Amino acid sequence: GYCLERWMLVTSDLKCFGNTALAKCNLDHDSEFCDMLKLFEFNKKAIETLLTHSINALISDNLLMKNRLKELLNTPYCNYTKFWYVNHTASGEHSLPRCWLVRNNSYLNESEFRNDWIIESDHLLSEMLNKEYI
Amino acid sequence: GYCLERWMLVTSDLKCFGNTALAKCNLDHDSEFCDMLKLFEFNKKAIETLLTHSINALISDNLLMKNRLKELLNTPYCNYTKFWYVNHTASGEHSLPRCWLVRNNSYLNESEFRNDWIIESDHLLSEMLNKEYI
Amino acid sequence: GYCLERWMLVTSDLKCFGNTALAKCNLDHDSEFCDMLKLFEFNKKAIETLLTHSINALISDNLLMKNRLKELLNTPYCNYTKFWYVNHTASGEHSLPRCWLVRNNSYLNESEFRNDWIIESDHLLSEMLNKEYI
Amino acid sequence: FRIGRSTELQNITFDMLKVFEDHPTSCMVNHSTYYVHENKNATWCLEVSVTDVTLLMAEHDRQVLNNLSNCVHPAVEHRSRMVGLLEWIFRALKYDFNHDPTPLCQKQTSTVNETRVQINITEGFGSHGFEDTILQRLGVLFGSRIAFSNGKKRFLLIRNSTWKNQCEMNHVNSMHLMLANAGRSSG
Amino acid sequence: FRIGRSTELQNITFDMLKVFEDHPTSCMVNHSTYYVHENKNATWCLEVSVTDVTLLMAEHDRQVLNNLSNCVHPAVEHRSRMVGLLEWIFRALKYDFNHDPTPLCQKQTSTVNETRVQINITEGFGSHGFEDTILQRLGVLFGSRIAFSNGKKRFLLIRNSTWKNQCEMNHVNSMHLMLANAGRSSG
Amino acid sequence: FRIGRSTELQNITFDMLKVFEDHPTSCMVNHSTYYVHENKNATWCLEVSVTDVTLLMAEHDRQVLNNLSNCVHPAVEHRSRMVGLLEWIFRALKYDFNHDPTPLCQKQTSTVNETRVQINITEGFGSHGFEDTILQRLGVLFGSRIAFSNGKKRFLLIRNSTWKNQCEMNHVNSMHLMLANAGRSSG
Numbered sequence A, B, C: 001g002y003c004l005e006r007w008m009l010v011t012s013d014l015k016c017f018g019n020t021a022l023a024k025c026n027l028d029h030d031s032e033f034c035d036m037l038k039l040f041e042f043n044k045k046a047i048e049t050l051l052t053h054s055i056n057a058l059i060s061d062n063l064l065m066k067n068r069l070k071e072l073l074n075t076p077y078c079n080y081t082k083f084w085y086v087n088h089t090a091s092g093e094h095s096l097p098r099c100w101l102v103r104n105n106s107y108l109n110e111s112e113f114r115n116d117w118i119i120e121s122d123h124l125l126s127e128m129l130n131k132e133y134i
Numbered sequence D, E, F: 001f002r003i004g005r006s007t008e009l010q011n012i013t014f015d016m017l018k019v020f021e022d023h024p025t026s027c028m029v030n031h032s033t034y035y036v037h038e039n040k041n042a043t044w045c046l047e048v049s050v051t052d053v054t055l056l057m058a059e060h061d062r063q064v065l066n067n068l069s070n071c072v073h074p075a076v077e078h079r080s081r082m083v084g085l086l087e088w089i090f091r092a093l094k095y096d097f098n099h100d101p102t103p104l105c106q107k108q109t110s111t112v113n114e115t116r117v118q119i120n121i122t123e124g125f126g127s128h129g130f131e132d133t134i135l136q137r138l139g140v141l142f143g144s145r146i147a148f149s150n151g152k153k154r155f156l157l158i159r160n161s162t163w164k165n166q167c168e169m170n171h172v173n174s175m176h177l178m179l180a181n182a183g184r185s186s187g
């Protein structure tokens, strides 16, 4: 699918995301991971061949504003650094990464958003089941 | 899950909502029920320990504006009082409550939004099936 | 379900959309097909019995603006003319139509958004399976 | 409600009075008259009315030019809080004091015991389109269909009055009023 | 289109001529010239062009200072409707008449039979950033890439002309023009 | 992380330094002091501080009236780029130069080698509500909670300084600064 480059991630290990999850970015939903990928794609195209003119299209202003207002209120917010996804290890199919929320200058513990990763895992498994039936 | 207090509801009967549906509020979707729950949580925290500074984060301004624009046009709108949810009685699993639309100073009849509760009911049952298979 | 009139479509063929897909327009999601249907419904009601006063409610301004920003950047955008839907021929049940994106004054080829129609097809089939089990 | 063999339609009605009891709220008597109330305990409300009649004359009355506070009498014990609510109303209406028509308020020596703030929303007095914006804002803020409703001059009059329970509280008008005035307090 | 064994890709194309026939619309000939049309039955259109050349001089021409209506000659039978469309264009451009550069319009005694409204969008004349805002608004409203495209003076000229089918109608330009002017009619 | 028998929780951390290296960024040292930097290679930064003390007096100092560029000395080789960053900061703060309090800048003959721009955000000097708006904008732009934090004069001072790594770079402040200044270049 879409393979992220070494410089994009701190880890420096190749991360290739399957086209179904990345396809979910094209939906009406405005995300924080999808925005960052759009920035990476714009930067790649710019290197091959301007950010001020495209910033409105690449970035969701409303989502950025709501995240910062969450930040100022000491509420868990998305600061656009870390993103968590559910990855079915055996098949390799994974959910669309979601922002790892941060509160009080510290990333939320896994338990603190347990439901968020619980339901996503269930949804992913459910989809896989349908693929077997289909 | 999240149990609403007696004063919050007119009925005065304890209503506890399960964590999966309430987890669906954390998604990108902006809802009217989720906004009201955020207001209730803010009020509870304020009582334990300001609404003007947090009103933007707690309430979706765009959704409020579109609901009122629907109101002024004699179109069914959400006035933030009553919310309908699909509750599988035997298991207790329920859908995320959705705003009971109102038109001409009267709540819509159940038939007038039948599809909304029909498809929602189906989705809930479908999810339950997956839980059995998973 | 909802049958579009002959003058609405360039094909001049009666296209009737089932109530489940059309019900998906009532959700929080702001679409381009749903906006156009709202415009058609407003026009029908106006003929039976003003567009400037209702334009804000009928049309999503943010979605229109983001589509225009994509247009100016030579990125695939929605110009509100053609819409693609996945239609299970045997049963007749179909997905909610989605905007056929256009780039460089030409509609995208089917392959250029293959994933978009792949996943929708899968989702549609999945729902049908549940209807058999339910 | 019996949706299906195993599924029921259920509803919950919200009581939001306690959340919104101590914060400014608004109501609508008719498409013309509106009452703005700071909170349940307050005994004074502000009446915003769209009236054809003229109550204040430029020659004999005061004009609001950066001195809105002087329109309220110093002797009232809620003077600052009243001026705060007035600022809430004007900010909620998206009023631009720099360019939008100069409001008029009652003379200091008036026998009548009401603070009256008169804004001329007639098309001739204001710049083009101002009447439309103000009427649409009134509908957005108070739920009125005055903008949709069909030369006669119009005025927007905000007078102070005793709270006589002229209207039931609405927490959605409260949300609109708070969203317009965000991160601010009465003053 | 055969997606799968049981699934087909299907499309519907929308004809929006009848919905948008009686409402103001716009088009784009080239990144510089644009035609604004009230409706199909109108025989007059307005041409918005980004031009280097200067057509109106301050010394010999009139200035738009709260009297835009006088720019259109009284003898034309659609003068009020023309002024309404002009106000639609200016509101769509988010023009601030109070602070943005004063528009110029043709002298009353001009031999030429076209109303010309000239706005100076050169960086020197306007306050800093005005040229960027105006060009971006032109791209947003007419679909142009003039802002992205690279001292030469720049002007925005709105002149009236006979509708000669200079461009195909676009209902998305119609949606943008209507959203900019919401709750108003030509006047 | 073991979500389930077959499911694992996995994360990816983003390195956005290279994407944002050549574009203006901002920081927060404390709720009062913030540094604005155009790009990594710049040796000069701009310090925005909320200070009680007064650095510029109206009688002895210059006032910003459509001549912000003159506040920066002509001898500096980054004069145009510095003025551009200043315009980026002011546009990011949603500053209305027409009506908001006149900024003051240092006298041309000042011995000190820093350009100082001082804005009076005290309630009395500014129109009502300006201090609230400006403080909320500072929180929105720099991540500060100064607005939430509780007569004392308050000022907004933007002085130029040498970039000595006063702050770690944040690409979210960079996104906010870019969104405020959209389709623009330093100048």
Ligand SMILES: *[C@@H]1O[C@H](CO)[C@@H](O[C@@H]2O[C@H](CO)[C@@H](O[C@@H]3O[C@H](CO[C@H]4O[C@H](CO)[C@@H](O)[C@H](O)[C@@H]4O)[C@@H](O)[C@H](O[C@H]4O[C@H](CO)[C@@H](O)[C@H](O)[C@@H]4O)[C@@H]3O)[C@H](O)[C@H]2NC(C)=O)[C@H](O)[C@H]1NC(C)=O
Pocket: A079, A080, A081, A102, A105, A106, A107, F168, F170, F171, F172
């Ligand atoms: C989103 O929010 C998260 C918070 O959850 C931020 O992630 C943190 O980012 C900070 C930088 O602001 C990181 O702190 C830096 O860590 C570096 C690694 O050295 C430390 O490593 C571990 C701690 O993780 C320790 O065991 C070890 O002893 C080291 O302390 C340091 O190089 C950095 O030091 C810099 O700052 C200090 C400040 O005192 C200076 O003294 C140093 O000279 C130097 O300048 C710094 O400490 C932190 O590790 C991150 N947290 C996590 C959990 O990873 C994201 O940055 C934030 N993103 C955005 C865009 O806002």
Ligand SMILES: *[C@@H]1O[C@H](CO)[C@@H](O[C@@H]2O[C@H](CO)[C@@H](O[C@@H]3O[C@H](CO[C@H]4O[C@H](CO)[C@@H](O)[C@H](O)[C@@H]4O)[C@@H](O)[C@H](O[C@H]4O[C@H](CO)[C@@H](O)[C@H](O)[C@@H]4O)[C@@H]3O)[C@H](O)[C@H]2NC(C)=O)[C@H](O)[C@H]1NC(C)=O
Pocket: C079, C080, C081, C102, C105, C106, C107, E168, E170, E171, E172
């Ligand atoms: C969304 O974006 C799509 C682009 O993907 C637009 O669809 C195109 O719309 C244009 C109009 O702007 C269509 O072009 C017109 O086609 C007509 C059909 O005649 C041609 O038919 C086929 C080509 O489709 C040829 O084999 C045949 O020989 C003809 O050429 C013509 O009647 C039109 O001609 C008009 O314009 C020309 C310009 O030179 C004049 O000379 C003519 O006199 C006349 O005025 C024109 O060529 C085009 O076919 C559409 N594309 C597709 C793929 O269908 C949507 O309109 C757009 N929607 C919005 C709302 O922006």
Ligand SMILES: *[C@@H]1O[C@H](CO)[C@@H](O[C@@H]2O[C@H](CO)[C@@H](O[C@@H]3O[C@H](CO[C@H]4O[C@H](CO)[C@@H](O)[C@H](O)[C@@H]4O)[C@@H](O)[C@H](O[C@H]4O[C@H](CO)[C@@H](O)[C@H](O)[C@@H]4O)[C@@H]3O)[C@H](O)[C@H]2NC(C)=O)[C@H](O)[C@H]1NC(C)=O
Pocket: D061, D062, D063, D064, D065, D066, D067, D068, D070, D071, D105
């Ligand atoms: C908010 O602040 C504004 C500031 O403008 C006040 O408006 C002024 O109020 C004063 C009274 O407080 C009045 O001043 C009068 O000026 C008259 C001449 O002004 C003419 O020109 C101005 C334009 O510059 C017009 O607005 C005005 O209508 C006049 O045409 C004098 O003739 C008046 O004299 C009267 O009073 C004196 C005693 O003070 C007597 O000796 C005279 O015989 C006569 O009775 C008077 O001085 C006037 O209303 C306003 N003037 C101006 C220049 O604006 C608002 O009142 C204030 N509002 C609040 C609510 O505080």
Ligand SMILES: *[C@@H]1O[C@H](CO)[C@@H](O[C@@H]2O[C@H](CO)[C@@H](O[C@@H]3O[C@H](CO[C@H]4O[C@H](CO)[C@@H](O)[C@H](O)[C@@H]4O)[C@@H](O)[C@H](O[C@H]4O[C@H](CO)[C@@H](O)[C@H](O)[C@@H]4O)[C@@H]3O)[C@H](O)[C@H]2NC(C)=O)[C@H](O)[C@H]1NC(C)=O
Pocket: D043, D044, D045, D071, D072, D073, D075, D076, D077, D108, D109, D110, D111, D112, D113, D114, D115, D160, D161, D162, D163
């Ligand atoms: C809506 O807003 C209006 C203001 O526009 C309020 O009406 C005012 O109410 C206050 C109450 O505080 C009134 O002030 C009181 O007025 C009395 C009568 O005023 C006379 O004053 C002198 C006396 O000769 C003369 O000019 C003339 O006869 C006036 O009629 C006074 O008796 C009061 O004075 C008492 O209190 C003060 C302060 O404590 C002491 O200094 C005095 O010694 C004395 O004890 C007092 O001044 C005011 O008059 C009203 N306005 C008008 C224009 O008349 C409404 O109350 C308000 N409504 C709501 C619901 O809030």
Ligand SMILES: *[C@@H]1O[C@H](CO)[C@@H](O[C@@H]2O[C@H](CO)[C@@H](O[C@@H]3O[C@H](CO[C@H]4O[C@H](CO)[C@@H](O)[C@H](O)[C@@H]4O)[C@@H](O)[C@H](O[C@H]4O[C@H](CO)[C@@H](O)[C@H](O)[C@@H]4O)[C@@H]3O)[C@H](O)[C@H]2NC(C)=O)[C@H](O)[C@H]1NC(C)=O
Pocket: E062, E063, E064, E065, E066, E067, E068, E070, E071, E105
């Ligand atoms: C919308 O309304 C504006 C109002 O500003 C009109 O602009 C005025 O138009 C009039 C003509 O109608 C012109 O007035 C001229 O003023 C000259 C002297 O004014 C001096 O000072 C003003 C500022 O105070 C400067 O702008 C100006 O340049 C001068 O320095 C006179 O020389 C002129 O006299 C001419 O006409 C008279 C007949 O009236 C002849 O006798 C003379 O010989 C000579 O030809 C004239 O009076 C001027 O253009 C504008 N004045 C101002 C103050 O702005 C617009 O015309 C109007 N536009 C529309 C479309 O309706």
Ligand SMILES: *[C@@H]1O[C@H](CO)[C@@H](O[C@@H]2O[C@H](CO)[C@@H](O[C@@H]3O[C@H](CO[C@H]4O[C@H](CO)[C@@H](O)[C@H](O)[C@@H]4O)[C@@H](O)[C@H](O[C@H]4O[C@H](CO)[C@@H](O)[C@H](O)[C@@H]4O)[C@@H]3O)[C@H](O)[C@H]2NC(C)=O)[C@H](O)[C@H]1NC(C)=O
Pocket: E043, E044, E045, E071, E072, E073, E075, E076, E077, E109, E110, E111, E112, E113, E114, E115, E160, E161, E162, E163
């Ligand atoms: C774009 O906008 C422009 C306006 O800027 C329009 O052009 C105007 O069109 C009108 C048509 O209504 C013209 O008005 C007519 O002009 C004729 C000639 O004008 C002369 O008038 C006197 C005659 O001596 C002299 O000053 C001089 O010779 C002028 O050239 C007149 O014959 C007409 O008068 C007739 O009608 C009126 C009213 O019904 C009667 O009172 C008369 O008795 C007579 O029957 C009339 O005034 C106007 O001249 C044009 N403007 C200019 C500047 O010339 C365009 O039409 C418009 N385009 C579109 C597509 O809408």
Ligand SMILES: *[C@@H]1O[C@H](CO)[C@@H](O[C@@H]2O[C@H](CO)[C@@H](O[C@@H]3O[C@H](CO[C@H]4O[C@H](CO)[C@@H](O)[C@H](O)[C@@H]4O)[C@@H](O)[C@H](O[C@H]4O[C@H](CO)[C@@H](O)[C@H](O)[C@@H]4O)[C@@H]3O)[C@H](O)[C@H]2NC(C)=O)[C@H](O)[C@H]1NC(C)=O
Pocket: F062, F063, F064, F065, F066, F067, F068, F070, F071, F105
């Ligand atoms: C941006 O542009 C503004 C334009 O407003 C400049 O501000 C002016 O700066 C000049 C100097 O360049 C100063 O003008 C001074 O005016 C005094 C008299 O003016 C009176 O009236 C005005 C209003 O009309 C009041 O603001 C002022 O306080 C006075 O009441 C004179 O006393 C001054 O003379 C001084 O300089 C001359 C040399 O030119 C010496 O001979 C004298 O002895 C004395 O030292 C002087 O002329 C004044 O500060 C501003 N004037 C106005 C009208 O605003 C900014 O300087 C400029 N800023 C930047 C950053 O470019």
Ligand SMILES: *[C@@H]1O[C@H](CO)[C@@H](O[C@@H]2O[C@H](CO)[C@@H](O[C@@H]3O[C@H](CO[C@H]4O[C@H](CO)[C@@H](O)[C@H](O)[C@@H]4O)[C@@H](O)[C@H](O[C@H]4O[C@H](CO)[C@@H](O)[C@H](O)[C@@H]4O)[C@@H]3O)[C@H](O)[C@H]2NC(C)=O)[C@H](O)[C@H]1NC(C)=O
Pocket: F043, F044, F045, F071, F072, F073, F075, F076, F077, F108, F109, F110, F111, F112, F113, F114, F115, F160, F161, F162, F163
């Ligand atoms: C933040 O912004 C400030 C501006 O406020 C910058 O500080 C200025 O820096 C410039 C250099 O770029 C300084 O200008 C230089 O000043 C030197 C000394 O000043 C004396 O100048 C004459 C000497 O007789 C007298 O008036 C008096 O003694 C002054 O003290 C000059 O020697 C320099 O001249 C050299 O360069 C020019 C230009 O090429 C040549 O024409 C000369 O021949 C010579 O080579 C020069 O003028 C300026 O003085 C500083 N500001 C102030 C207010 O004095 C900061 O650099 C900037 N910081 C950052 C980090 O961006």
Ligand SMILES: *[C@@H]1O[C@H](CO)[C@@H](O[C@@H]2O[C@H](CO)[C@@H](O[C@@H]3O[C@H](CO)[C@@H](O)[C@H](O)[C@@H]3O)[C@H](O)[C@H]2NC(C)=O)[C@H](O)[C@H]1NC(C)=O
Pocket: D054, D056, D057, D058, D120, D122, D123, D124, D125, D126, D151, D153
């Ligand atoms: C509120 O604004 C309206 C509209 O601007 C004001 O009404 C206007 O009043 C003036 C008088 O100052 C009228 O001017 C007169 O008009 C007649 C023609 O009918 C003429 O005989 C006179 O010579 C003079 O020009 C003006 O027409 C009128 N406008 C309208 C649209 O009716 C009103 O006075 C304002 N109210 C207050 C309290 O200021």
Ligand SMILES: *[C@@H]1O[C@H](CO)[C@@H](O[C@@H]2O[C@H](CO)[C@@H](O[C@@H]3O[C@H](CO)[C@@H](O)[C@H](O)[C@@H]3O)[C@H](O)[C@H]2NC(C)=O)[C@H](O)[C@H]1NC(C)=O
Pocket: E054, E056, E057, E058, E120, E122, E123, E124, E125, E126, E151, E153
């Ligand atoms: C539209 O705005 C532009 C820019 O403000 C105007 O151009 C400007 O015209 C003035 C003349 O009034 C020029 O001033 C002169 O400049 C020369 C230097 O080239 C100098 O010799 C003269 O002493 C005088 O200062 C000014 O430079 C020029 N600006 C630019 C950027 O070119 C233009 O006139 C305006 N158009 C209309 C119709 O008003």
Ligand SMILES: *[C@@H]1O[C@H](CO)[C@@H](O[C@@H]2O[C@H](CO)[C@@H](O[C@@H]3O[C@H](CO)[C@@H](O)[C@H](O)[C@@H]3O)[C@H](O)[C@H]2NC(C)=O)[C@H](O)[C@H]1NC(C)=O
Pocket: F054, F056, F057, F058, F120, F122, F123, F124, F125, F126, F151, F152, F153
């Ligand atoms: C920044 O704005 C503040 C607030 O407007 C200014 O402080 C104000 O300064 C004026 C004098 O210019 C003070 O007025 C004086 O009040 C005293 C009584 O307190 C009175 O006896 C004097 O006759 C005079 O009227 C005003 O009180 C003061 N306000 C505050 C809140 O401190 C300040 O001067 C402005 N600074 C700059 C550099 O522009």
Ligand SMILES: *[C@@H]1O[C@H](CO)[C@@H](O[C@@H]2O[C@H](CO)[C@@H](O)[C@H](O)[C@H]2NC(C)=O)[C@H](O)[C@H]1NC(C)=O
Pocket: C011, C107, E010, E011, E012
């Ligand atoms: C949209 O669907 C239409 C049918 O409504 C497709 O047009 C058909 O294409 C087939 C294959 O070439 C022809 O046999 C039919 O005659 C066409 N029908 C009509 C009415 O023109 C069309 O391919 C689709 N549009 C796309 C893919 O852009």
Ligand SMILES: [K+]
Pocket: D098, D099, E098, E099, F098, F099
């Ligand atoms: K202004």
